[PDB]
Amino acid sequence: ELDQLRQEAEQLKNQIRDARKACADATLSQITNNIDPVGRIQMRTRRTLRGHLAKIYAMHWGTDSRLLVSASQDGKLIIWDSYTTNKVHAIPLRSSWVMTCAYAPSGNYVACGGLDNICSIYNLKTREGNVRVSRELAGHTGYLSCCRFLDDNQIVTSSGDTTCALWDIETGQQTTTFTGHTGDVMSLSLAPDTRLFVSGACDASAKLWDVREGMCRQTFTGHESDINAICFFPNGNAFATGSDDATCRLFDLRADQELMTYSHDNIICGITSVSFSKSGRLLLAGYDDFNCNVWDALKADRAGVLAGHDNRVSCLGVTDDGMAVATGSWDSFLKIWN
Template sequence: MPCTWVMACAYAPSGCAVACGGLDNKCSVYPLSLDKNENLAAKKKSVAMHTNYLSACSFTNSDMQILTSSGDGTCALWDVESGQLLQSFHGHAADVLCLDLAPSETGNTFVSGGCDKKVNVWDMRSGQCIQSFETHESDINSVRYYPSGDAFASGSDDATCRLYDLRADREVAIYSKESIIFGVSSVDFSLSGRLLFGGYNDYTINVWDVLKGTRVSILFGHENRVSTLRVSPDGTAFCTGSWDHTLRIWA
């Protein structure tokens, strides 16, 4: 690995490469298929270079471009082969902590969240912020598009998850309870969009009914904060990663 503290990773759509980065301020892309005599480090490509830590990365709809966010307050789109900066996105007033690409059929947009308590929606072609929401009361650690692409959820250190409708241009739901006082590190939707999963810093996973706004389940098992969460592509399970050094599959 290029640095001792990796904060972001992403698979290429083809499954033939993986990107990662963190406190080294850059995004490195590694091929996953090598001849037995090839050295992995020698095949590494340093693609993105920020002026502060890399917080998130995501390939676009091909292996040829990658989107990054950084503690330098920017997001950027890069050409993987040449390492050339294709577009930069300026609009956050503090560290950008997370990003998510819209479903491919809905257009060339992505959403980002950060330490300025703002969530911005960007047009990847123009580099312009086309929508912005500022209803959280603390850092935004995670954002995830609704499966249809018409809305997105966010998770924050203010101990809430929130749902924003892009067509209505407003926040439409808050998922919280008075008993929940710890921050949300990661969010993701079920395949149908009916459930919202949130990983929390109190070692739990809360499951919310998106339409009713109620908690339908709370899952225990981790022994330290839940740092990441992702639903499987077929929707039958989800995986969580934690500071307890484990990955857990829930089904």
């Protein structure tokens, strides 16, 4: 009986709502009320990486905090040495419709994907002196939005077919499939321990997934519109998501609800990327009003603004050591801030 199932679902939703409300004894604003604000944070463009002849859609750091990878619609995946701005490798893509890129923690491989529905894994540390396509992971009936390496032989992808996948690169076959989203999944954030991750979708919801088991543990729904970016808090007990509602939100996995909203009346545009600082006190959000906002994660204040780009800020990253911030945009330029 479908009516009974609908009523039971409504009852369970009400139970969860009441449980979450009972745990809201205090707000993050009250607890952190008596904390010294960060004041004004002025960061300057210490590097500007040039060479892409089109919009830059993705950008990832290496684990050495010196090498990064960038993906552009001109068919190029470029590896930059941030300190010297030198180009280490230029990878011509078989398809120029790239929407994501990832850097293996070891630095031996990079990942690429987009509207071709294939995650191409490229091997950098090879003899013969040239980067070659190690793998072409297929089996997504929709474009790839984000991809991340768990290790040199495991990769997690999110697709526009509402599904996430966990692949073994060597075999080339999906070892797990995560389903439950009703709209296309736009972002994907691996946990510090790489035991579970979070995926946000256009259904205005985020889901916490246990990588090993292959199931959704919790579902967070606060946004009015699509979630385009998700990032984990450094300790893995919270994460931040930015939506087209011109708002970012911080969710706590233990309280199973929302802790703080980051929005301003003078911001009415979408959020394309979010990232935390090493200590978790700064939340960097990239906007399509062509600038980035640096927020006090514990006070909802806007500590600073990064205004250097002439077009949409589409990708944003912070090094593992917390030293520099990389911003990419459709203006075809990357910038490093400190």
